[PDB]
Amino acid sequence: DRFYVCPPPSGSTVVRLEPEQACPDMLSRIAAAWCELQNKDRTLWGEMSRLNPSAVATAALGQRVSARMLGDVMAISRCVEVRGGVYVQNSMRVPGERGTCYSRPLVTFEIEGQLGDDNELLISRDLIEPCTGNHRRYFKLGGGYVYYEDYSYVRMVEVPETISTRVTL
Amino acid sequence: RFYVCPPPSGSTVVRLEPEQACDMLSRIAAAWCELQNKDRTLWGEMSRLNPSAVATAALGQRVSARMLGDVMAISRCVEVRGGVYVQNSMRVPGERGTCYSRPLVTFEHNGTGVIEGQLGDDNELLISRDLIEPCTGNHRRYFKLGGGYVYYEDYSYVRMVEVPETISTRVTLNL
Amino acid sequence: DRFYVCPPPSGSTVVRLEPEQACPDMLSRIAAAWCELQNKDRTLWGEMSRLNPSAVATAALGQRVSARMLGDVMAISRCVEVRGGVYVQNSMRVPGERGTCYSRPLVTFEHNGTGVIEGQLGDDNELLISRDLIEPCTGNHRRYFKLGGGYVYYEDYSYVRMVEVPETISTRVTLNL
């Protein structure tokens, strides 16, 4: 899948989450339940907007967007594809400090940033954690995954095993 | 509307209904069942951070709630009757650096008298004024207030606004 | 329901949450929206999998598993039934320091792999071998923990009685056909 950078949301585009919607023979009990379902779910969507507004808004608009909460309202900025080659960097240790490492891999792309959630590329290399033993991480990188051990790069891996929360109809 | 939330007591205690035992309208019915079983886990996880919002959704009436271990304490929320005064400055008078996360309000009714509290989520008026955060530059906020929203640049009131711009995760089913 | 121990997931089995799928007159309008609904829904599961991957995994599989993140992927390990009896401690007060307390009850139970484990009641009837879920103490302290098919009641950090909570609240949407 594609790489995006996410431009900071300005206080310009301000939107909110579509409120609960009023609700209206076996094609009719289904329609009302479907409505009541959608309404109730909005409470879950509400809670997520608080913490992960970006991901609530991408799902809502069907496009890659960045978001921040400015209180009780959302500030939307469109994301941009990175056509280039992206390159991951061997170490994940911070060259100026010991006992601190980047929590996610460093990359360079066409600038010196680091890998975010779901193939987002950041410019800010500032996701850091205290270092650990048995440090093992798999990071989604484009179509595949890249594996790290003791914060030193190891290999690109496939992860075929899959778990699902879909309901089959 | 507006609401005050009394603190729930250990009087009536409830819990989330557990997962349930489960031609085309039959498979659909089955999927519908399973979907409810699966969503159940989403509701459970939220009920720990925000039991209130879980309860009110499940109840149909604005309620408040707290977790007592794995069980939930409830109280109905009182509907606010009367005018409201929104303060203009969200800076705490007591200290520099620290301010209010949401706008202060004064309103009044029921037992017993005028309350100096603050604006909560989803048009809940709080009594406790403790929603505190250190000051930041270029600090824009909006806060839901009744139907519309109240704008706030660098920690003080500007104007009343609106938001025609609606974003939906809702899914449509036109039968 | 039944009790469960949960071995720590080594990265031996590592999984990912299955991606969204491309979506295909009145019956069609449904399966379409049903598919768009699962698609949308996946963002919620993506989120939860970040705080409680164990619960995301057990819902997915239909069995009690315990998970932990290793980056953007889930280490899975299948949980095992505990079958012997169980001793519940009366006092959720921690022995070492005043003011510090367990936030879930202490249990002792016996396993088949290892022997007697001095553990602790956890969510949805899981038994943990650790005894380190620790909050500070409080007055006015009332808790109800899920234990077997009932709930056990504690006041001021010490056992009281075996309650039942008949009272139920629900987010379910009924559909009758």
Author numbering:
A (entry chain B): 64 to 87, 489 to 574, 581 to 639
B (entry chain A): 65 to 86, 489 to 641
C (entry chain C): 64 to 87, 489 to 641
Sentences from the study reporting this entry:
Thus, we recombinantly expressed a truncated PRV gB protein, denoted as PRV gB-D_IV, which includes the domain IV and a portion of the adjacent domain III central helix. Based on the ELISA experiments, all the 14 complement-dependent neutralizing antibodies can bind to both gB and gB-D_IV, indicating the epitopes of these antibodies are very probably within the domain IV of gB. In order to further characterize the immunogenic properties of PRV gB and identify the epitopes of these neutralizing antibodies, we determined the crystal structures of PRV gB and gB-D_IV at 3.1 and 2.7 Å resolution, respectively. Domain IV wraps around the top of the central helix bundle to form a crown in the bottle-shaped gB trimer. The trimerization interfaces are highly stable, such that the truncated gB-D_IV could also assemble into trimers. The structure of gB-D_IV trimer could be ideally superimposed with the corresponding portion in the context of the entire gB ectodomain, with a rmsd of 0.598 Å. The highly stable structure of gB-D_IV further supported the conclusion from our ELISA based assays that these complement-dependent neutralizing antibodies target the crown region of PRV gB and very probably within domain IV. Based on the gB structure we present in this study, domain IV is located on the apexes of the gB trimer to form a "crown", making it fully accessible for both antibody and potential receptor recognition. However, all the antibodies targeting domain IV of gB reported to date do not directly block PRV entry but dependent on the complement effect instead, as shown by cell-based assays in vitro. This phenomenon implies that domain IV is probably not a receptor binding site for PRV gB, and that it might retain the same fold before and after membrane fusion with only domain rearrangement in the process of gB conformational changes to mediate membrane fusion.
